[model samples]
Every structure is written in structure tokens, then in C-alpha cells.
Target: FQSMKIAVIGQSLFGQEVYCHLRKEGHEVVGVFTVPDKDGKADPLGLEAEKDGVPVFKYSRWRAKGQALPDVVAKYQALGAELNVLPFCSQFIPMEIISAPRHGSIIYHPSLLPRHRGASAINWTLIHGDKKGGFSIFWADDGLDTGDLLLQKECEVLPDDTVSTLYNRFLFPEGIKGMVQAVRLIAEGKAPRLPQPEEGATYEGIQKKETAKINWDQPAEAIHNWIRGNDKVPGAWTEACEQKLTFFNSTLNTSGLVPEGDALPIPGAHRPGVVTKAGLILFGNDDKMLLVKNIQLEDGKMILASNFFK
Candidate 1:
């Protein structure tokens, strides 16, 4: 681990954190690769890599080119690399690139493999009301997060855990520690590689904006998970006709005969998107109801649901 030169690739907020942590561990991260930043400008990881005097390369098709396409990899290939560790990389790297490294590449998946094996694992699993989830460090193979399992760490999905809190309090830190430990195991050549159960392994696609809508008619618990799962991303939203309303936080009223989207503003007199003391209430069927705590009007900047209506 001390003498190994590595190439790291990842994007997104968690990716930036992992990139920084790897550099701090005294390894020569010869290259830090990420997708080109938004708006044609430099991003944080790029800046940090530059500051460390490491070569920063941009790769839009990480899996397509694998490792050989990068000039930086060519330069480093001459230097030789023991392994390529993917902390939170989202791209799909096949055996072509995985086979290039001296000891091969290893990847870190956020969920217990043989379960949620694709992108948006945490969000989808939690939204589906799974009681628990875990991390998996595995050998990188052609499949999507489906390589051999190395190590795993689990977390109890709390009833109230939102995507934001779940990532910050659990997944983010878990990944940091988990990835570091996985690297150590690889260095020791003690990591056990085991194939995942084909029956248990599953893939989920990107969580779309439609997944963020509040459906008042659904079960109280289902709506709760849906809203929470979408936190800090697209955000949970409801609308009164064409007037888009953002629902920030919510609670279950568990009352009788709730409409499809009526939780806040006391649905009797006001229309949908109306503000109530509880929050933004949408009408549901008579069976269940939603009590939202925050909201924002369409086309208007976001504010507290109660305040926005005020």
C-alpha cells in the first residue's frame, strides 16, 4: 500500500470526499480522474488533485476507454501500478481495464451485494422500505457492482432516515472507513473473494424526478419513505393544477379518509398546495393522510412551506 501508485476515478459529492481521503493516506495517487465539471469549469476534486501536484485527467467514458485511453495512465503504466482502487466510482469498468493493473482493480459498492447492486442503491432500497442495507467491497468485474465480494458492513435503516441523513450519518462515513479497510485487506492479500448469489443480486436504475412526487392516496408509510428517500436531490413535490409546490418535510397524520394529496392547509376550504399549520397538505383518499412541514411555490425560490404560504 505504501509504495503502490494508483489511479482513482469518481464523481459526485461522496466521490470528492473519497478522493481527498485516499491522497491523505501516503499513497501516490498518480492520477485523479473524474467527469468534466458542470458549466465547463473546474471542480473541487480537480482543484485538490492539482494542488497535490497529481495529474488530473478528464474522462467522460471511463468504462469505454478503461485505463489505457488516458495519457496519464500511459505515463503511470510505465511507472507501474500495483492496483487501482475505486472508492465511489459510478462508471462501469470491464475486465479490459480491470486486468491492466498489476494486482487488478477493486471496487466499493454501497449496499450489501446480492441485494441492491446498481446505482441509487441506498435511495431505492430505503424507499422500498428495506429494514437494513450495507456496503460491499469487491473485485471489479464486467457486471454492474456484481463482482466478487470482499468485505461488507451493514446499517439498520432507521424509520426516520432520509437520503441526506442516511448518507451523511451512515453511508458516507461507512464508505470512508470501509474503503480504507478494504484497501488494507488487498494490501495484505488476505481479502476473501467470493461470488455473489445470482438470485439475490439486483440492479436499479436512476431514481427519476417522478419518484419524488407526493401521492396522498398511498399508504402513510409508503408516502413517508418516498418523500424521505428523495431528500436533497430532486425533492418531494406536489402541485395545485399547474402550480408546482415543493414539500420539504412531512409527518403522517394517520387519520381516516385522506385524499390523494391533502395533508396541509386543512383541505376542507383551500385547494391543493394550500398552506396549513401542519405544513403543505395534499389531499389523499379517505384511508390515509400526509402532514407536510415545508414547501415552496412554483417559480418562486424555496422557503419553509409554512413561510412560503405566509
Candidate 2:
């Protein structure tokens, strides 16, 4: 099969990866569209395009009122980009721009669409203690991730999984694979447009600091999930020793439990959010504790819980 002519609309590492990989496989990436860089920093996708002699356009926003949007689309039209790919873009791409290509556009979402159809899919999936997580590639429509599904792949969510681990170990790579397969199907004239089911749909709003705050009254597993869900981004936090501390890499403490007739006394119940020296624990609901292995104080470096206590 002949290589397809494509245009990529994305930002950051994921977009760059898609552009580079497709181009490396001899597809003609005619143009790249990404957000303008911050404070003179380079745009990852745009820089890759420049290195490969592909035209690049950086915009703060695309609106119908301005000539800029039209002008950019004209570039894609001129270059004969057969497909437009959105790897990790969040901007409002107008319908004109979406339909500029012969095959229209396709987008990547972090969740199996019809569920967790929002900007914070990964965060919500982990927060809810989901047993599975996956990514989706779908044809882009006017609505939010409401397009016909093109491809999907699922990965197991381990008991101690965090967002970083889930993405790096499973979702990110699988997403790349799914995108490639979807594009090839399109090129072969065999791509399916499966309408998303109406049932089993859920949308998670953008997670905020308020939502990320640790609720110590929740069950041990719930607290553990919350900490792991928000790890390294808008971290789950609570006050400790008169200071705010963000937590990461947490697990429910299954230790310190003994049989009723055992010699050891039952571990004394501690107030929620109380840090205990043994096992670097944070007491939670149900008289249980979450062992927070990593922690960071406000304006301080992230340190291991053992070190933090010392």
C-alpha cells in the first residue's frame, strides 16, 4: 500500500511521537499544527516538523472570526494532506478545519469513549479504582469525544497502579499502536465507523485542587486510590505537622493485623491523617492506614516517607 499524506494537530510529547513515527515509516507528513510555545520554549511537534522540512503552524487559538484559521486550513489543502490526526490536542478545531482533509480528522482519547469523555480521563479512571484502563481512536465530530469509534485497546489496572505507571506501561504505547493501525485501515478503505453506544457513558470534569484534596474520612482503599490517582499532578494533599504535604506512591497497609488470639495487641486506632512512625503510615478511615511511600512538603523537594519522617 502507498504511504498516506497526513497532517498532525497536537502538542507535547505524544503529538511529537506520532508525527515522528509516521514520518519515519515513510508517510508524508505535509504539515503540523500545534500551540505556540511558552516563553520562547520550542513546541515539540513543531520542532520535529521543522527538522523534517515539513511546514508548521503555531496558534494560540483557532476561531472562525479570524483569517488565521482559514489561512492554516489553506496550507493543509494546498499540501494535499489526506488525513488530519489529533494525537493530544485540546483546542477547539473548527468544523472547517476538521473537514479540510479528504478523510476528515481522527482524535485520541485516554479512555474507552462513551465513558470518561473529558479532559481528565486518566485521573478519573484511577480515582474510581477502575480495574481496566484503555485508549480510544475515533473519528472527530463536533461534540466532545462523541465521534464514531475507530479503534480501542484495554490494559489491566494493577492494584497499586498510578497514573504515571498506567500511561507509561500500557496506555501510551498502546495508543500509538492503535493510531497506526487505524490510519492503515483508513488507507486500505476498510476503516469502520462504529457509533458509540448510548449506555455506559460517563463524563469526568477537569480535576481541580479542591477535588484532589485528601479526604481522610474515606475508607482505606478509597484514600489509597485517591493518592495514587493524582500522583505527580495536582497531587492528593493533606495538612501534617501544621504544613501542607502532597502524597504519592501510596498503598493500603495490610500489615499490623493479627488473629484475635495472637500475642500482639491490636494496633491502636489513630486519627485519620495522623502520620505514624511505623511503616511511614497515614491513618485513614475504618481504623486503617495508607502507607504513603513518597511525600513532598510545600516548597520542598519530594522525598521518601522514611526520609521525610527522619
Candidate 3:
């Protein structure tokens, strides 16, 4: 098969990996589009492209006042890109550029679309407690993850899975393989665009810290899922003795009864936000309990919940 002249719309380590893999496969990567430096730290993708001598374009926005910026479009077209590979893109890519490529664009979505189709797709997959987890490589269109599927792969969702664990373990590795496969298909002129089935589709906004605030009123499992879903990211938080406390590394306290210890007595100690012991005992409305090993107060020092008062 012929090598593709590809433009990568991507950022982060994941994006960097895709760019490296594509070049290794003999694709003629025309240029890379990534985010500019923030707080004086440049995106890893941009840095990698520089190392390989591939042109990298950083645009704060593709459009202003509803009109696509002509300069950005002009530079992108000059690359003569036959296809666009979107690995970890966060910016809103205008259709002008997406449509310019001869084979259009292929994007990596970290879920079985149309299930969790948004910025926080993997987070929502864990949040919603889906038994099965997977990723999608699809043709990018105007709609939110509504494009036709180029390919997909699935994996199990374990009870103890967290966003970090699930991503680094299954979705991230499997996702890259799928991307490589899709590129091969595109090169062979065999890539397919099956329309996305709209049934069971869902969309959610980013999982912000405020949005990840613990809902103590729900069942212990729901609360547990919330904590793990956002684990180590915008960690699911709660107020502890007036300090905003973020939780991590959670597990269900299988013991039905609380072990003997002086619990952190707060409002409605019988229900939510009760720190029962050094095991960091926590619960919701139900009898089930969640044991979180570590927590971070607003002070930003992550300490064992057991050591909070010690």
C-alpha cells in the first residue's frame, strides 16, 4: 500500500506516541498541530515533533467571531496532507481543515461511541459503571463523536478500576493499536465509515472539580464509583472539618459492620462524611462502606486519611 501524507491534530504523550508510530510505519507525516505552551511548559507532542524535524503548528483557536482564521487554514493546506489523524486533540478543529484532506480525518475516541462521547469519555465510562469498556477510531465530522466508525475494540471494566488504571492499562495501549490498524486500512483504500447508531448515545461535559464533588446522599457504591472514576484527576472531593478533601485509592469495605474505632463524628455521622477509623472508613446512606487509603485536604498535601488528625 502507498504511504499517507498525514497531518496529526494532537497533543500530550498519547499524541506523541501516535506521531512516532505513524512515522515508523512509513507514513509521510506532513505536519503536527498541537497546543501552545502553558505556564511555560510546552506540550509533549510539540516537543517530539521538533525532535523529528516535523513542522508543528500551535493555534490558540481555529476561529474568531465565528469565522475560521485564514492564516491557520492557509498554512494547513500548504502541507498537502492527504489525511488527518486526531489522537488527543482538544481544540475545536474547523471543518475547513478537516475536509481539506483527501481521505478526510480519523479520530481516536476512548469509548464505544455513541456511549460516552465527550471530553471526559473514559471518566464517564467509569462514572456510569459500564461493565464493558472500549475505544473507537472513527471518521471525524461536525457532530460530537457521531461520525461513522472506522474501527473499535473492547475490554472489561474491573470493580477496582480507576480512570488512571483503566486508561494506562487497556484503553491507551489498545487505542494506539487500533489507530495504527485504521491507518493501514486507509492506506489500502479499505477504510469504512459505517454511520454511528444513535441509540444509547450519551454526551457529558468535562469532569470539572466542582462537577466531581462527592454526592454523599447516594449509595455507597455510587459514591465509590464517583471517587474512583475521578481518581487522581479532578478527584472526587468532600468537605472535611471545613477543608475541601479530595479522595483517592478506594475499595469497598466488604465487612457489613463497621469495625470498632472512634469515628470522625460529623453531621449525620450515621450516614455520609463520617471518618470512622484509620482505615479511613466512609459510607453513604446504605450499609456498604468505602475505604479510601489516601486523601488531600485543601492544603494540597496528599496524606493517608488515617493520618489526617495524627
Candidate 4:
């Protein structure tokens, strides 16, 4: 397929990867749209775009008053962009701007689409205990991620998967390949536009701190999913021994004791979320236990359960 003139909009690491990959593939990147940095810190994609000599547009929002259309559209038109690519961009691009390109625009979303259609797709997929999770490349439409799908690929949600683990290990790398494939398809005019199904659609807003709190009363697996789902960000937390603590690196100790055989249980029964010398041993339904292998106290450094006990 022949290289095309493309406009890319994105932010964060994912955005940077996509921008860099497109440039590496030798596309004529006409413009890069990204959010402004805070405290003089540069957004990854914005910096890369500038370094590559692509014109960059930094804005908080795209909508404006008393204008035929936002200046972004005219800017892209001047650049003669043939396609628009959004890889992790959160800003809303008016249809006029995105649709201006010959091939219109395509976006990268880190979910299967139709389900988990919002920002918290990764977190919600794990939090809801979905057996599989994946990413979708779709044409950008007026609706909220309700665009026609171009291509999608699924991966298993391992029992130990977390939001961080899934993205870092599987989704991020595969997503780049998927995006490249999607772009190639568009270039070859082989990309199919499959309308998303209305049924089985679900939307999850951003995962909030309140949603990360562990509810011990839930089933053992549910509580496990909560902790794993929110790991490494707004960590699944709970108040223990009158002190708040964020938990991580846990395993469902169904045997009612640490598998290591050194940290023996204190015998008899214990309440859920009970603090123990070996760590926080919490009971769940069917008498299961959650062995919190790591924890961080309020404003304190993260420590191993053994170190925390010490």
C-alpha cells in the first residue's frame, strides 16, 4: 500500500507509540493534535510530533463559539491530510475535522467495543470479571465510541490479570500491530465498516476511588477481581485496624493458609479483613481467604506483608 498524508491526535504513552510507529512506517504525518502539558511537562506524542517536524496543535477542547468550524479543520485541510488517526486521544474532534480527510478517521479503543465502550474499558473489563478482553480499531463517528468497527482481536483475561498487567503485557504491543493493520487495510481499501450492535452494549465511566474500595462481603472471586482490576492505580483499598491501606499482589488463598507453609494460620476462624502477622488474612464466602502479599499504608511506602508485619 502507498503511504498517505495523515493527521494524528493523541496523548500519553500509547499516543506516542502510535505516532512514532506511523512515522516509522513512512506516512506523511501532516499534523499532531494533543493536550497541553502541566507544569512545563511535555506530552509524549506532542513532543514526538514536534521532533518529527509535524505541526502540533495543543488544545483543551475543540468546540468554540462564533466560528463556522474550529480552526483545527482548516489547519488539517491546509496540510492536505488524507486520513486522521486517533490513538488514545480523549478530546472530542468535530465530525467536520475528522471527516475532512479522504479516508476520514480511525480510532483505537482498548476494549472489544459494544461492551466497555467508555474510558474505563480496561478497568471495567477486569472489574466485571470478563473472561476475555481485547482492543478495537473503528471508524470515528458522532456517537460515543459507537463507530463502525474495522477490526478487533481478543485475548484471554488470565486469572492473574490486572489493568496494568493486561495493558503492559498484552494490549499495548498488540494494539500497535492492530492499528498498523487497520491503517494498511484503509490504505488498500480493504477495511470493512461493521456497525456495532446495539444489544449487549455497556458503558463504564472512569473508575473512581470509591469504586476501588474492597467490599469484603462480596464473594471471594468478586473481591479478588476488585483488587486485581484496580491494581497499581487508585489501588483497591480498605480500612484495617483503624488504618487505611491499599492492597496489591494478592492471591486467593483457598487453602485457608499461605501456600508457603511458613506463615501458618492462627488457628480456628477469623473475620474477613482481619489483620494477621503474615499479612492481612481476610475470609470470604465458602471460607476462602485473600492473602494480601503487598500493601501500602497511608502516605507510606509499599512493603511486603512480612516487612509490614515487622
Best prediction by lDDT: 3
Q: List the residue pairs that clash in candidate 2.
A: none
- TM-score for every candidate vs. truth? 0.82, 0.86, 0.93, 0.85
Ranking by lDDT: 3, 4, 2, 1
| Model 1 agreement with the true structure over 229-278: per-residue lDDT tens digits | 77756677665545666665666653452333333442222234445444
lDDT tens digits, residues 1-310, model 2?
6688998988877888888888877789988888886878998888988987899988765665654466666766788888899998775687777877889999998987888988868888899999988999999998888999998888888988888889888878888888888888887889999999999899887877678887766777888899899976778887666677788889875487321221211133235333444335655567666677777878878877666646
Model 2, poorest ten-residue lDDT window?
Answer: 257-266
lDDT per residue (tens digit) for residues 1-310 in model 4 = 8799988888888888888778788788888888987869999888988887889988765677843355766666788889999988775677777678889899999999999998868888988999999999999988889999999989999886888999998789999888888888887889999999999899987777777877666666777788888887778887754677788876665454543423423323245354455666656655667777788888878887656546
The stretch of ten residues in a row with the least summed lDDT in candidate 4 is: 260-269
**What TM-score does candidate 2 get on C-alpha atoms?**
0.86
**Residue pairs whose backbone atoms clash in candidate 3:** none
Best-fitting candidate, scored by TM-score = 3
Range of the 10 consecutive residues with the lowest summed lDDT in candidate 1: 261-270
* Global CA lDDT computed for model 2: 0.79
Off by over 4 Å in 3: 256-262, 265-278
Model 2 Cα RMSD, Å? 4.9
lDDT of 3 by residue, 1-310 (tens): 9898999998888898899899999998899999888869999989999988988999778788897898888889889999999998765688998888989999998989889888878889988888998999999898777889999899999987999999999888888889999999999999988888979999987888999987677777887888899997889887767678889988885566464554554454345444545457777777668788888879899888777777
